[PDB]
Amino acid sequence: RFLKVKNWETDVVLTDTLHLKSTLETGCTEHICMGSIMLPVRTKDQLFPLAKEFLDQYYSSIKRFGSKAHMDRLEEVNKEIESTSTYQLKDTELIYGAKHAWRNASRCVGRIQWSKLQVFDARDCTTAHGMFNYICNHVKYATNKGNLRSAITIFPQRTDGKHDFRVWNSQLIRYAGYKQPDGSTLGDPANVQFTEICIQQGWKAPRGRFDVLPLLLQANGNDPELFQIPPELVLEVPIRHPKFDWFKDLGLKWYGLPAVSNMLLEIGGLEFSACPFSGWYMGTEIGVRDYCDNSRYNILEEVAKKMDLDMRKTSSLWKDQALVEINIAVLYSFQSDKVTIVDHHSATESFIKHMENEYRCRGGCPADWVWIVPPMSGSITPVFHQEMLNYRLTPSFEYQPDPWNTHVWKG
Template sequence: MGNLPAVLPSAARSCGLGLCSRQLSAAPEETTGTERGSTTPTRPAEPPRFARLKNWETGSIGYDTLCAQALQELPCSGQRCLGSLVLPRPLPAPVPEGARPPEELLGLARDFITQYYLSLRRENSPAHAQRLREVEAAIAATGTYQLLEPELVFGAKQAWRNAARCVGRIQWNKLQVFDARDCANVGEMFSFLCTHIQYATNRGNIRSAITIFPQRTPGRGDFRIWNTQLIRYAGYRQPDGSVRGDPANVDITELCIHHGWTPGDGRFDVLPLLLQGPEEPPELFPLPPELVLEVPLQHPTLEWFGELGLRWYALPAVSNMLLEIGGLEFPAAPFNGWYMSSEIGTRNLCDSQRYNLLPEVALRMGLDTRTTSSLWKDKAAVEVNVAVLHSYQVAKVTIVDHHAATESFVKHMENELRTRGGCPADWVWIVPPISGSLTPVFHQEMVNYQLCPTFRYQPDAWKVYVSKGTTVTRRKTFKEVANAVKISAKLMGHMMARRVKATILYATETGPLIPAATHPRGPLRPGRTRHRRRALPQLLAAPAAPPESRRCPPGQHGAGVRVPLLRAGPHLPAGDAGGAGAGGPQPVLTAFSREPGTPKTYVQDVLRTQMAAEVHRVLCQSAGHMYVCGDVTMATEVLQTVQHILVQQAGMTLGQAGDFISELRDKNRYHEDIFGLTFRTQEVAFRIRSQSFSMQERRQPGPAP
């Protein structure tokens, strides 16, 4: 980093790259760690506090103080930097020979539980103290503990947020977490993975998701996915030493063949999944073709490009990394985002050790490949990237170009520095493999360190697998796979049937999703929710939908359960609508804030004047849920209105009402889906959670309004 001393006195424990330092001053003893003429570094008198980071394009200066919280050593030292190594020796997580010592696990668990309650602004609350006691008791009794589902969700999102090598972290808080910790065998594992692929692919509108399988348990084998990604193309080694297909996947291809897979002979053959259970040998599971969305590659102006027969899959789902949360390790936790175009167009297709398309494309383009000064590689690589972007956009499959991705990362980093005090980032991985200096991240100094929760590299599954006496497993037929999926779906149907039925009505400001939400074949059908938990009485506060959606399909409700929908906005005319159930037609209450000639009315006004008794009944008497969907201002005012309703209807003080809503959050019964400026996610969440009147009342007692 150009504005830091060339080498700090020693490797800073709080920052693995040795870049964290307390504020620099003019005093020589503060800016150097060696005596004049000495080559032996000495430790600074005080521990490092922060890293000073400069953007050489804009001249702006930022300070990373979060690095002081990193306790895990990275491989760099005061004498050498190993930041350009893909897998430095200390990075892969070793396979533990036994359980973590209880005192080590307890320390990691306490740190994570405190992180969780800090995120809720409930640190040192009775709920926080009680949860710590539960974890301590579990570790003392069993040597381990289990995460609650909200803790698991929080931990998975934080792990993505902390992933220093990921450029797409601006979406970290939108990660969909699938809890598969009750998975019992590889057959169920395959069903969970099929569900993940189907959800995340979403017919091309890619959604970020992670599926988390059971945690590592001492004395028992691991659940592992042997494939590096859920979808990969085979690589067939040829007699002359060349590879047909993807050379990166030669090892897993040969393993699949060894375990019974009948290979093809194409350049883009989708590999089966090779799955391992705790007490089961690895088994093969071919992916149903309808699950794998692929994009044929064509060029907008080079007509011959389609003749190359190229294609790539839509979903990049990494499946060989270890997720660590609170000292617990999850060796099988596949996750996905969506592609940045240069990952496909530059690395996968153009790297000489991968598909190596540059010579063929350059020849077709008529470029002079005899000399590097013709820049034939650069010209051909650009056209391959153009083809990838064009093809994915034509196929309506989510993809982002490297300029947009890196601009969003700079905004994410600025936001993290402002709201969190830092952003771990590995410059070598963040800068894209094409047009690096043309992107803003090239000019931005970064500091690399590891925080927990985290994703970690781990040894390849086949290198640590111990055979139980069976070396080859018979390949599963498609009929067997279909039967396994059918049985899994039937079991899920029985579980769904036991729930109390409820209808959640959908609302949108823009309207494009209305056909999917109201059509009987759409993704939200009467009697179904997106939640796996038992349906309970619910209140939904959300923006308005266009007029055509005001009539909703018939639905079923539990006896006596009303599910009112609150909508606010300029689009929906006055009137009632709803699904017919045991209680008759359900009301839709409207609030207009931009209707000409009409007094402004907001969701919180409807709550206060028409729904106060219902809010009290659902939240205080029926153990129900409240969903708030809107921008930060609306969500804040709804929260304050609910507190006043609890004061009036339940006889609480403002402080008690604030604490009650905080407890609802702890129990995942008060939900907030805040939209608006994507880049302000953390700031918005912080603002919402700081609106409780509890502290205000304790400072300034006064009568309830």
């Protein structure tokens, strides 16, 4: 079967066949659409088909489908599963797998970049100290003094679910949040709970507005351990505005390296529960969400006060006006310090070209519109006008519950 998507700005129509390869379910039914819901040990039995499907894909991609090398590899994985109940990926399969999980990530607007990903194989890691070293090298490599490079570090896969490698941090770099006795929050309100866990595990909190959190790392199912990232490895950008000289005095800064550390990478039925990956920021992630969400740094009022906007009615659009100025400031600062960043116009334009390419060469591009459309100026970006089909391909990145809810403590 074929499915069509139309761009309502250009009348360009694309034909999707790739959705035929989708197996995993979406949360939607014929009677209900869950497209805006945020979250909508395997047996040998279920493992071999998953391994086979993956290796078929891998072998097709290298133009060796059906070859003796293909067949030997299938047989070899089959026997490995048969007798050890799991199997190990070759380096080449691991790289391909991690690239494809990104390629298949339907909420990611940055996917034009998917084939340039530096993959760090950390499958020989055995301890939390070992994980700390690997993550430091990843940060330094990815950061590259401002010329950011995409990378992923992949720790040992799940075995019995009792020996998981996990990075407890949600992102490798994030600022502490501290709930005050008066109910106010100092620092980032999104990280309060994790900040409390770190303190409890023994971290000495400086208690300021922009304290980089320590890493909390679990190797092989053991209790997690605390490590501080060397400050010299944490690139930060002080935020200032090209025309507004009072902007610097708000005291804002942000880190350059966006790096997700809480997701699960699935490749051929294998589960990599610690797989931190990084790219570079789109400006709106910081300037719209991190700075302006009511439940985050929430700076809109203070910014619009200083711009002396009329704040007595929402209809003066004071929030919208202050929002644009903040986002100009974030982009200006990163640019001035030579730290890679992309604006939402450029990123969405690139994504449309990427999506069109994928439709030609691949037969589709699963995309989640809710997430792809930027959180400001939606309809003056080309993605707003683009119909998209969302479905689930493997390899994939998956959400997993926070480990403090599930961890069995050794004490």
